[PDB]
Amino acid sequence: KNIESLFDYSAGQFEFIDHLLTMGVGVHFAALIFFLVVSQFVAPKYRIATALSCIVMVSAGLILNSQAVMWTDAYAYVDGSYQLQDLTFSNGYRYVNWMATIPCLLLQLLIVLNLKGKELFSTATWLILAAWGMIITGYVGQLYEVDDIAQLMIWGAVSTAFFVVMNWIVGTKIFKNRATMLGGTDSTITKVFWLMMFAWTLYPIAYLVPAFMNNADGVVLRQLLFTIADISSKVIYGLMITYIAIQQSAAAGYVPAQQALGRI
Ligand SMILES: *C/C=C(C)/C=C/C=C(C)/C=C/C1=C(C)CCCC1(C)C
Ligand SMILES: CCCCCCCCCCCCCCCC
Ligand SMILES: CCCCCCCCCCCCCC
Ligand SMILES: CCCCCCCCC
Ligand SMILES: CCCCCCCCC
Ligand SMILES: CCCCCC
Numbered sequence: 101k102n103i104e105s106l107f108d109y110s111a112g113q114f115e116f117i118d119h120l121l122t123m124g125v126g127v128h129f130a131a132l133i134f135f136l137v138v139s140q141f142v143a144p145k146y147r148i149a150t151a152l153s154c155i156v157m158v159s160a161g162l163i164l165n166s167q168a169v170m171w172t173d174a175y176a177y178v179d180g181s182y183q184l185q186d187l188t189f190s191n192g193y194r195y196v197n198w199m200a201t202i203p204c205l206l207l208q209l210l211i212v213l214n215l216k217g218k219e220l221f222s223t224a225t226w227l228i229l230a231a232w233g234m235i236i237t238g239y240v241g242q243l244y245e246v247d248d249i250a251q252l253m254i255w256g257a258v259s260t261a262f263f264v265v266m267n268w269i270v271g272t273k274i275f276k277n278r279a280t281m282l283g284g285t286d287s288t289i290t291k292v293f294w295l296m297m298f299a300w301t302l303y304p305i306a307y308l309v310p311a312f313m314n315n316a317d318g319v320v321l322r323q324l325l326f327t328i329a330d331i332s333s334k335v336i337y338g339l340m341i342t343y344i345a346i347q348q349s350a351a352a353g354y355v356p357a358q359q360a361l362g363r364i
């Protein structure tokens with residue numbers, strides 16, 4: 101079970117969560133349109149980094165819309181508060197989105213990093229492997245967020261071990277391949293790494309909400325952190341990857357990338 105199913109919610113708490121999720125759908129699909137449009141101004145060897153953002157926007161947007169539908173269908177406003185009608189709302193569908201979107205977010209980083217060939221394939225394999233372990237162990241720990249907080253923290257500790265290893269591999273490859281990047285994007289890519297580390301750390305914090313704020317307000321706070329983390333890790337992060345791909349495109353002489361930057 102999950103802590104969401106434990107509480108009734110005031111109209112203010114319930115509708116705030118609903119608007120957070122609905123706004124998340126709108127923001128992800130709004131970025132989707134932008135990424136599709138701007139991808140033509142990216143050189144062919146970087147265009148797959150922009151395509152990966154489109155895939156992330158589609159899958160993140162569809163699953164956020166599924167959760168807003170489940171949120172509305174699970175509770176009804178009875179006797180002055182929103183009460184659970186159906187055992188249907190699960191944050192586990194976020195975990196399947198994460199397993200879908202995390203590899204795409206990692207791959208588009210490696211591409212603008214100018215990883216190629218054997219090093220690109222092998223690095224992607226280990227990063228996806230480390231992400232798989234982080235998601236599966238975290239998903240099992242999330243099963244005990246109501247019944248046994250101790251198991252939530254023990255599985256979260258193992259999941260964090262995968263998280264630290266994944267970031268070490270990413271930081272290692274950035275430090276090693278920064279110099280190959282054009283147009284000053286070698287400076288930009290490590291700030292993207294800092295944003296990635298800040299944004300991805302918001303997820304384990306929301307994961308631990310049942311352990312330090314197990315009430316209706318903690319449920320609101322958790323969806324708030326997820327909303328901030330999604331927009332940061334997918335939309336803002338994707339905009340920076342796209343800027344890097346366009347900047348390196350223009351630096352290599354790709355003409356339509358140069359007009360796009362001339363407008364700003
Ligand atoms: C768009 C969604 C993204 C980038 C999700 C990222 C998720 C994580 C970095 C998850 C991290 C976790 C741990 C490090 C420990 C506790 C369990 C997890 C799975 C929440
Ligand atoms: C040419 C670069 C392609 C990069 C794609 C790498 C895919 C490697 C797949 C590794 C298998 C990991 C299985 C974990 C998923 C459950
Ligand atoms: C690129 C170098 C980044 C180094 C960051 C080190 C942060 C260490 C984390 C300590 C725990 C913080 C938990 C919020
Ligand atoms: C937990 C953050 C790991 C950062 C790795 C940096 C490695 C650079 C050589
Ligand atoms: C309640 C509005 C949430 C918007 C979060 C945006 C985060 C950007 C860093
Ligand atoms: C840059 C080579 C294409 C990447 C395929 C995932």
Ligand SMILES: CCCCCC
Binds near residue numbers: 219222223226
């Ligand atoms: C070069 C791929 C990194 C290996 C991680 C174990």
